[PDB]
Design a protein around this ligand. Structure first.
Ligand SMILES: CO[C@H]1O[C@H](CO)[C@@H](O)[C@H](O[C@H]2O[C@H](CO)[C@@H](O)[C@H](O)[C@@H]2O)[C@@H]1O
Ligand SMILES: CO[C@H]1O[C@H](CO)[C@@H](O)[C@H](O[C@H]2O[C@H](CO)[C@@H](O)[C@H](O)[C@@H]2O)[C@@H]1O
Ligand SMILES: *[C@@H]1O[C@H](CO)[C@@H](O)[C@H](O)[C@H]1NC(C)=O
Ligand SMILES: *[C@@H]1O[C@H](CO)[C@@H](O)[C@H](O)[C@H]1NC(C)=O
Ligand SMILES: [Ca+2]
Ligand SMILES: [Ca+2]
Ligand SMILES: [Mn+2]
Ligand SMILES: [Mn+2]
Lengths: 239, 239
């Protein structure tokens, strides 16, 4: 269609218009939990979950040279009982048939397969990652610190900014795409006003198909944490 | 979710987020055609078609006493080579599992079954009808003229206004529900400024389930016409 929007002030477990993949679920307490927990609510190793909004977004139209804008606002928090929590949460855009790739329960954030994770020609993923785990022994593509990144068909972010994950604290995020400037902008803020900004010039018509779904992905490998989405609103208009 | 909106400036045959029922289709020339035509494009007898937007609207929430507003704007035109064309087109709201009932290809507008069409206790349909056929020999519930009506769980409109269908002319329609006044308002206009207004007080929480789908229905029995939707935008916010 020419435009689509939705808003979740909170999520409820009855929500009809989201697609859960892997370990993702909306809890009975109204939190969207992307990764698995044991019966005590403790995060566990080797888990991946994603959610997609069910309606399919017209990101661009080849026969008319129309391109959509979009704006995605959301808030999340992460918790872990241990040091060096992993692996992170991402807002992402992918073809509507997208599924969790094998080998992605870890630093690939549920978004990529190991043999092609850095191969821009192979992937169909645009993502904004909140990447808490950076160890060189397995995340060779990361800078040596937790970071916010924009991922264009690769797990190696096109651009990153330094970000110190705060245990249990809500981060508020606004992601916007402007097709006239071909700019994808991210602004994230913690409650004290600390602000994180990352932006990339990217022509969405060369990185993604005409129809897409939007959503979130998270994963934990050998290190773990809960990945908790509290709210989400989205709008897209084909211009 | 807490809100949802979409817009079709035009329809395209590739549209991913609509559900076609019966004879409905979006043509290669970008018109949403609800009822069947022969190979020359001529309307035919005994046809019914409906479309639904795929995303499910939260019309109300019982555990929080929240009720949604909504606003639906659309335009349509009807064509027939013969006199007394039939049967009409309706915007409607129904449970998400809704399907064309048997016996509805005619004056029941694809919305009701003959034995219960006037039984408010049985149905789950809220509709705004543009009803072109009124013959007492089969449409006993209609006034003796073409009319615009608001249908609350019955094919006998709660309220009607006189309307002379114009062959091939676009009618523009705005339908709005205000939950604070429990008022469903319809305003329709022809290109010369002729205006049709109909409004009913109705508590949507007593006539429809908490989750619904929205869309359009049309049918032809022994008399026929094409039922052509040109554009449609919709918004709903749970208050
Ligand atoms: C504690 O294990 C760390 O070091 C191991 C090698 O000594 C790695 O195999 C291991 O990587 C896995 O877990 C990390 C952290 O969750 C994850 O990013 C990666 O994709 C693997 O699943 C880890 O770095
Ligand atoms: C030309 O047929 C008209 O009169 C018949 C009886 O003499 C009716 O059976 C017939 O009704 C069917 O067609 C109408 C018009 O399309 C429709 O409204 C009704 O639901 C029946 O399908 C028609 O009135
Ligand atoms: C990257 O993926 C493309 C598409 O399959 C492939 O042609 C190319 O060989 C890959 N690059 C490498 C280094 O394997
Ligand atoms: C109307 O439908 C209700 C619900 O099934 C039913 O109880 C009632 O008998 C019907 N009324 C008539 C007149 O048949
Ligand atoms: Ca990482
Ligand atoms: Ca009628
Ligand atoms: Mn990273
Ligand atoms: Mn009528």
């Amino acid at each position: 269609s020419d435009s689509l929007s939705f808003s979740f002030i909170n999520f409820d477990q009855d929500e009809r218009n989201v697609i859960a993949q892997g370990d993702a679920r909306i809890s009975g307490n109204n939190i969207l939990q992307l990764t698995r927990t044991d019966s005590d609510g403790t995060p566990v190793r080797s888990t991946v979950g994603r959610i997609l909004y069910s309606a399919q977004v017209r990101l661009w139209e080849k026969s008319t040279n129309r391109v959509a804008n979009f704006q995605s606002q959301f808030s999340f928090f992460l918790e872990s009982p241990l040091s060096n929590p992993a692996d992170g949460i991402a807002f992402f855009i992918a073809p509507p048939d997208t599924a969790i790739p094998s080998g992605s329960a870890g630093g690939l954030l549920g978004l990529f397969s190991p043999k092609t994770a850095q191969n821009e020609s192979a992937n169909q993923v645009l993502a904004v990652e909140f990447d808490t785990f950076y160890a060189q022994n397995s995340n060779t593509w990361d800078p040596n610190y937790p970071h916010i990144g924009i991922d264009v068909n690769s797990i190696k972010s096109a651009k990153t900014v330094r970000w110190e994950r705060r245990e249990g604290v809500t981060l508020n995020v606004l992601v916007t795409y402007n097709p006239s400037t071909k700019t994808l902008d991210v602004v994230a803020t913690y409650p004290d006003g600390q602000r994180y900004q990352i932006s990339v010039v990217v022509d969405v018509t060369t990185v993604l198909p005409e129809w897409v779904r939007v959503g979130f992905s998270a994963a934990s490998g050998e290190q773990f944490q809960t990945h908790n989405l509290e709210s989400w609103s989205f709008t897209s208009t084909l211009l």
